């Protein structure tokens, strides 16, 4: 803990590496989709959540940024949706009941959303001065 909300970020570098790593984790989910790797979706989605939680963890329990407050909602929700979506994959036979075709669309939408959501977070830190 500390007290009042923070205007900017604690560590500039930590943020960059935290965001840069997020984009990479997402690529794993996308690449696995095009290569039809439902079994790789479980881990690919998990690794992505780590970057999301790890990044948010660096932030205080009470942010002082307008976009930071909302960004935490979409960011956290992004990793949550991907986990729940990937959680129900089609590792079994190809004739399974699950809609494998729809699965790829779900992971792509979530991955693309979380990936783009990071752009707004990385740009906010760079543009920010905290002086």
Radius of gyration of the chain (CA): 16
Closest CA to 35 of 104, 97, 102, 120: 104
- Residue where the block lists tokens 């494998």: 100
Six-digit token string for 32 = 């696995």
Say what angle helices 38-57 and 100-127 make with each other, to 10 degrees: 20
For residue 16, report the phi and psi dihedrals to the nearest 5 degrees.
-55, -55
For residue 49, report the phi and psi dihedrals to the nearest 5 degrees.
-65, -35
Q: Got the DSSP string for 19-73? A: HHHHHHHHHHHHHHHHTT-HHHHHHHHHHHHHHHHHHHHTS-SSB--HHHHHHHH
| Residues facing 63 on adjacent strands | 6
Q: How was this structure determined?
A: NMR
Residues 41/89, Cβ–Cβ less than 8 Å: yes
Alpha carbon distance 20, 45 (integer Å) = 16
Structural domain boundaries of the chain? 1-131
Closest CA to 122 of 46, 31, 35, 13: 13
Secondary structure of residue 19 in the 3-state scheme: helix
CATH number of 1-131: 1.20.120.330
Alpha carbon distance 64, 68 (integer Å) = 8
Angle ∠(51,12,52) on CA atoms, nearest 5: 15
Give the C-alpha distances (Å, rounded to integers) separating 49 from 32, 55, 74, 107, 126.
Answer: 16, 10, 13, 13, 23
Six-digit token string for 98 = 């699950």
Six-digit token string for 26 = 């997402």
Alpha carbon distance 86, 43 (integer Å) = 9
């Amino acid at each position: 803990l500390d007290g009042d909300p923070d205007p900017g970020l604690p560590s500039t570098e930590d943020v960059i590496l935290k965001t840069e790593q997020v984009t990479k984790n997402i690529q794993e989910l996308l690449r696995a989709a095009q290569e039809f790797k439902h079994d790789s979706f479980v881990p690919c989605s998990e690794k992505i959540h780590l970057a999301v939680t790890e990044m948010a963890s660096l932030f205080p329990k009470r942010p002082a940024l307008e976009p930071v407050r909302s960004s935490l909602r979409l960011l956290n929700a992004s990793a949550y949706r991907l986990q729940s979506e990937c959680r129900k994959t089609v590792p079994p036979e190809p004739g399974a009941p699950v809609d494998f075709q729809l699965l790829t669309q779900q992971v792509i939408q979530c991955a693309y959303d979380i990936a783009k959501a990071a752009k707004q977070l990385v740009t906010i830190t760079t543009r920010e001065k905290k002086q």
